[PDB]
Symmetry: D2
Amino acid sequence: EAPAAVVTGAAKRIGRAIAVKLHQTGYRVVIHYHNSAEAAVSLADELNKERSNTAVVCQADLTNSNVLPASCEEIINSCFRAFGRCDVLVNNASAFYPTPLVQGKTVETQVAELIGTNAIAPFLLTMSFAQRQSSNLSIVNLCDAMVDQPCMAFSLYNMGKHALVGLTQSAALELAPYGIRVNGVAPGVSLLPVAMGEEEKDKWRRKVPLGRREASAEQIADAVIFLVSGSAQYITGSIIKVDGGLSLVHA
Amino acid sequence: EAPAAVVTGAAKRIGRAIAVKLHQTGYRVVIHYHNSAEAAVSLADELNKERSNTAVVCQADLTNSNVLPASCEEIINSCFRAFGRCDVLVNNASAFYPTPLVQGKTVETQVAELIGTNAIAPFLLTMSFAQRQSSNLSIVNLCDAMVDQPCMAFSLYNMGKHALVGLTQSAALELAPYGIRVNGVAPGVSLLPVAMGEEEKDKWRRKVPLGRREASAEQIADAVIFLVSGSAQYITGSIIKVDGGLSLVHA
Amino acid sequence: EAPAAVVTGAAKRIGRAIAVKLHQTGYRVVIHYHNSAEAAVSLADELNKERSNTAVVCQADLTNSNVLPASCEEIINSCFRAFGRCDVLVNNASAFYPTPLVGKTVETQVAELIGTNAIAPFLLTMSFAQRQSNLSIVNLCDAMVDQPCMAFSLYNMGKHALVGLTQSAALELAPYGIRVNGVAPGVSLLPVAMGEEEKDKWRRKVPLGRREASAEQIADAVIFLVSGSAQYITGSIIKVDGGLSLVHA
Amino acid sequence: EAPAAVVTGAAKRIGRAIAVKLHQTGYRVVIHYHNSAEAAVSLADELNKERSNTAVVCQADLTNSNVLPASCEEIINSCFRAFGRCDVLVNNASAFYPTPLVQGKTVETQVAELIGTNAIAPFLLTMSFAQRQKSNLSIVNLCDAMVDQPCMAFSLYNMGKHALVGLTQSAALELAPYGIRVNGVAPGVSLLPVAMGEEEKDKWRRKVPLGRREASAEQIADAVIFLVSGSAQYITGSIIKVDGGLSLVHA
Ligand SMILES: NC(=O)c1ccc[n+]([C@@H]2O[C@H](COP(=O)([O-])OP(=O)(O)OC[C@H]3O[C@@H](n4cnc5c(N)ncnc54)[C@H](OP(=O)(O)O)[C@@H]3O)[C@@H](O)[C@H]2O)c1
Ligand SMILES: NC(=O)c1ccc[n+]([C@@H]2O[C@H](COP(=O)([O-])OP(=O)(O)OC[C@H]3O[C@@H](n4cnc5c(N)ncnc54)[C@H](OP(=O)(O)O)[C@@H]3O)[C@@H](O)[C@H]2O)c1
Ligand SMILES: NC(=O)c1ccc[n+]([C@@H]2O[C@H](COP(=O)([O-])OP(=O)(O)OC[C@H]3O[C@@H](n4cnc5c(N)ncnc54)[C@H](OP(=O)(O)O)[C@@H]3O)[C@@H](O)[C@H]2O)c1
Ligand SMILES: NC(=O)c1ccc[n+]([C@@H]2O[C@H](COP(=O)([O-])OP(=O)(O)OC[C@H]3O[C@@H](n4cnc5c(N)ncnc54)[C@H](OP(=O)(O)O)[C@@H]3O)[C@@H](O)[C@H]2O)c1
Ligand SMILES: Nc1nc(N)c2c(-c3ccccc3)c(-c3ccc(Br)cc3)[nH]c2n1
Ligand SMILES: Nc1nc(N)c2c(-c3ccccc3)c(-c3ccc(Br)cc3)[nH]c2n1
Ligand SMILES: Nc1nc(N)c2c(-c3ccccc3)c(-c3ccc(Br)cc3)[nH]c2n1
Ligand SMILES: Nc1nc(N)c2c(-c3ccccc3)c(-c3ccc(Br)cc3)[nH]c2n1
């Protein structure tokens, strides 16, 4: 029978691309979302129309809180519900905005959001994924290739992305006895943020040595697909950059 | 007059060695502690017996919560109250224990203590240290040379230490325009846990290529006070391992 | 027409599996070898007997010396002569033996270890870039580069050099559309030569399945990096180590 | 009795600054040099005026060749003949010029020079240092903080420096039983070529978060002094960036 995948924040952009490619590949999918209800379901529609009863949505806030453990357990239960199993988890949902260390939301809701989405939620979803368990179980976390050359005033965001690296590695180690492989994919400049002015998008595009453009979500998705495939059966603890060389450029 | 430093989790072991070294090099010191009140006031007595009015204790749970921001603000304030300045902050305090992904603290609490002590409280304390500001201002984060080869089942801890790497870097970037340098010191195996039985202590020592033993607490302190000193005026963002070669030893 | 690939040290073990997989994917191949000439011409038969005229062999010593640049120029040149093109270069060949800080001369140890693992790869890359689709290079790195074997420093030195090439050439060749990346095995394809004790010694260390990578698992990552699914990947090095580099002493 | 150090390319600039400081710390010094005989000797003199019979010079080419092992072995013997002991070795001489991949030394020569100076000579020097020694014995390699963010068209230089990281770690591990520590110091932007236009110099300075200026050679030397000191006695395999945050700045 077909294998099943959760993708968090899958309604749009890189998560959507990841869900769709998983689906094209043969996976059933749980499309998680938080605010983007309509677009989660029009994606479920498009997927179901290709193959019936192979895409469900599932809603949750992944901010850090007393209920996040329960919420994450439910994101996983929702895959066991819909489809009777969970083979793959993709931690993609991510909050991303500035948090200057100096003044010239409150700071703890910033902690909860940035940290929760980017680290703690992936950790709990990792627990829950593992608890339930010729399989090919793997997890893939959306990392950041610029993690060691971070943007100005984004410390919390970066602490979250650093912790996810930490999680990737710890969980790879601890869960390899179970055959649960844990890897990551590190976009650099990919789909630019929607509000960003077009002249700012071009600035960033120009930085990238491979063809002076951002990666398509599709291109990110391909690195994910590879890591979930049987061609990655010996890979765990690896974080593939997909950055066009961006991480290599000195200031 | 004499500079002032805050050392978190300073009552004993490595934090006490830092406090002491900074005091001998001529700093006044805030000795932050959590539960170890006796050892803390005992340390501050010794240090004030050496040099009257140069040491204070300040108490605070560094567990993550919505008041942790004010608790950190107050640690910094305590230093400005007692001494009129704050030149150096050492982020030493840390919670350490297994958090197995697969199986009595709640996980939420496990998250709050492990992330909050090793990453969030430092972020917050950095913000406040920055906010409150001839001078040689620096921060020194106690990190972990094994961060990329972590203990089995210490994933929340390892995510906190990783995030602490991220802060060190992002903060160093963000606060260099203020002349605030931000660096780290990364033990490997130093003073073993108080209640580890000698036999297990030795398994760990035998792994150290340089001497087959652990770093004394002073050996850690030395790296700290180097990084604080004017012999490091241009160092920012560096984390210095003090692991006697252990991170280089493969399995 | 079908793309072409150079694989160094492709007569046997990982290098061979890589030449084979690239052939299955529809590439023509230049099979480089040094001493393993019998194996090398046998491989070429297999592949040519499967698709005619799609494999040649090419002998070279990749030890550092003043004729290396010429040797490396000629390996690339061999691919152009045999196939009219060269889309992919795989730096695989590598010398591997202890060189303690306390057989052969230290100058011969330097020239074999640094040559094979670093200098030939740099030379071959140069020649590859200068003779010019989905063009790219894959360097076989080493997942244990930052946690090495005791006494293997010339070797390690080579591998570190390789990382730097991989990055330096990734960045430099990008405006020419050449991608450069790496695959980094942990403990892989253990010989029958090694003792059961010593083979089990390494196998016990690997978190994922208590075993070494197969030649073909290392090759899989290679072909992923040359494929149209890696078009935005350059500068990247993929560990394929079953968790080994995450294991503390 | 006074300890003794070898410093390669000690005539000028950073290595001289290292020699001076080792000297001012109490070291007798071997000042090695290749073409700068006149400044080598003027330094030997300046130092010997300070303390008689504490500084010699030793000329050699450190390009890779059949005679490099012997030339390196001599350099070490030179310190032994002069001072009766070899305590510290600082590998600092480096060739540095662009070697583009794509269309007037021959490439064989460039290899020999860039890899010999940066990598093979430090290895051969490390062998002989070690061979003689079988206390506070340490080696310090001058590394590069931009080694993973390389300058465009400096592949052979970058390979050199990369191999050097590899030696540091390899040697640290292997020489640890002999009590010999092996560390590195990783300048980012220090002394700019004398002849480089100030307008070109400023483009590098302005990159540097910490004070928008290059490291002085004494700042680099402060890190080396630390590494050789008794404060660094458990420190091996470590590389300390001295870069004012430039390694942290993205494109
Ligand atoms: N874009 C890039 O160039 C880039 C660069 C480096 C790394 N990455 C990483 O690659 C991944 C994908 O990036 P992206 O730009 O596609 O992400 P994105 O557009 O910022 O957001 C991804 C999704 O995360 C979900 N999300 C945000 N906050 C949440 C919360 N509190 N609870 C639950 N879900 C939440 C959102 O879902 P709803 O819309 O359903 O509310 C959103 O659609 C991320 O992990 C990102 O950090 C991306
Ligand atoms: N020891 C090692 O071998 C080693 C290895 C790697 C890294 N490091 C790092 O070096 C630093 C010192 O190590 P160590 O072994 O001396 O640390 P430790 O004794 O395990 O912890 C130091 C102190 O941190 C404080 N702390 C713990 N939980 C807290 C909470 N919720 N709120 C406030 N404070 C809390 C405690 O103070 P009270 O006693 O007053 O409660 C504790 O005494 C740590 O960051 C550690 O991770 C040490
Ligand atoms: N095997 C592992 O576990 C492992 C681990 C980490 C990294 N890697 C890397 O992955 C790659 C493949 O590994 P491997 O174990 O398959 O390699 P291997 O069998 O040790 O060597 C492969 C080939 O390199 C060639 N070679 C050696 N010295 C040479 C010289 N002076 N000139 C030209 N060619 C020479 C030999 O060709 P001939 O037989 O024709 O003489 C040999 O067949 C290597 O770069 C290796 O370092 C492997
Ligand atoms: N300055 C920087 O910004 C920077 C940045 C990153 C790393 N570093 C590293 O820090 C170290 C010192 O840098 P620096 O700028 O002061 O050095 P440098 O001036 O570029 O060169 C140092 C010395 O190396 C010697 N040298 C060159 N080729 C040689 C050969 N074939 N054999 C023997 N010696 C040779 C020269 O000695 P003679 O003059 O006697 O011929 C020269 O004075 C170097 O290893 C460098 O790579 C420096
Ligand atoms: N969830 C999420 N969304 C994003 N949109 C980004 C973006 C993003 C922001 C601006 C332009 C392109 C991508 C990044 C990001 C991280 C480090 C650096 Br250096 C640069 C960008 N992380 C991100 N994470
Ligand atoms: N606050 C704190 N206390 C500690 N006692 C440790 C210890 C510690 C405990 C037992 C034996 C050696 C060290 C560590 C630690 C970090 C990485 C690895 Br791999 C292993 C342990 N972090 C620690 N952090
Ligand atoms: N060209 C080449 N051949 C090899 N056979 C190896 C081997 C190898 C060694 C022992 C058993 C099997 C393969 C490795 C290798 C590198 C780092 C560590 Br830590 C351990 C092994 N590199 C290698 N490179
Ligand atoms: N032996 C040597 N000398 C130098 N003068 C440099 C310089 C240097 C040359 C000009 C301006 C600034 C520094 C560098 C260097 C390292 C990383 C980058 Br990204 C760029 C240059 N390495 C060097 N190595």
